[PDB]
Amino acid sequence: DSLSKEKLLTNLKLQQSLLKGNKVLMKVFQETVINAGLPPSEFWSTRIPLLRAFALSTSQKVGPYNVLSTIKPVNKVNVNLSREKILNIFENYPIVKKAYTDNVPKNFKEPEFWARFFSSKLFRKLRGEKIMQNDRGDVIIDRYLTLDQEFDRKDDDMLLHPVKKIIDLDGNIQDDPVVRGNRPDFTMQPGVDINGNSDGTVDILKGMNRLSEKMIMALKNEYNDERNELKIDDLNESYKTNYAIIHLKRNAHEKTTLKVSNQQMLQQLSLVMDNLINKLDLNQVVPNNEVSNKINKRVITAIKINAKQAKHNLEVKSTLPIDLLESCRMLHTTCCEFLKHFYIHFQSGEQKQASTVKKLYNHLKDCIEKL
């Protein structure tokens, strides 16, 4: 797709937006590619996850949802509209975008259009409100009511498809084609008015059900099963782990770059035991005031070395001026970048990139000259 490495390397506008956003990488590209003549594909071959993150920060979109249910007024009543809510209205409701295309750039402005829509009966129908006749509505949006019913019919036509026999309720009512019992009463039937025509709440039920079905089918894009469904997994055997087991052998090799017998072991042991038996003067550990000086000198020299090393160990302050320090730091940075690219092409072992390896070597030699 668009997330492949070759797509990320050739996306110039993404790099444009990244350098407009980033500052330190902008300076690295300024003092590395623009001045020293490094190829830009070489610069972006090492920064593929950063380009991917910058692209995916804006490429992803939120899930579809009932945006008009979230719309609610708060005499003066105010409703706050964000651009994401407008886009969700356009995607979730094609009738509003259809009115927007031929209404806003032609006759009246966008806030006027949204206030007309919010004052119209089409908003009430799309939100699921049962349509009332005493409300005035908005006539401009009310011209789109018939085309909204046309969209409803087209969506109901395209959404229809043969379901499996597991959930075939249309089958269930047609199991007996000539079943004819006593008719269901008004409780089992949709509500009707005093004349006999419907009250219109089945219309709002169909509208919200169609909205839910649209939300589910909106997930179907580029972005035997009955045997598995009727199988009872609980009665089947539990899952057995097929994890790998290793046996480790400690028969390594010794590190490579006097044999004495048990008799003198026994005599040395006897010497230690009777030297323990007779007497240990604990004052014999005191040095003869001569080896103490030498060992003290050794200890003090070790202390001096360790203290000199550990005296100095956010970057530390430097004696260089900030202009010279910044120049040295950026020269170190382009040294590191050129060495990075040279070692990447050098260790990637292709004879086809030998010319690039030679160019990186020449750039490194010129950077040695710059140092």
Binding site: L19, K23, M26, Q30, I34
Partner: peptide, 21 residues
Amino acid sequence: EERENEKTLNDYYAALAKKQA
């Protein structure tokens, strides 16, 4: 100021587009 930096960057990218085309 980074205004001259992005102006020279846009000029460089325009020259690169002219060379590539």
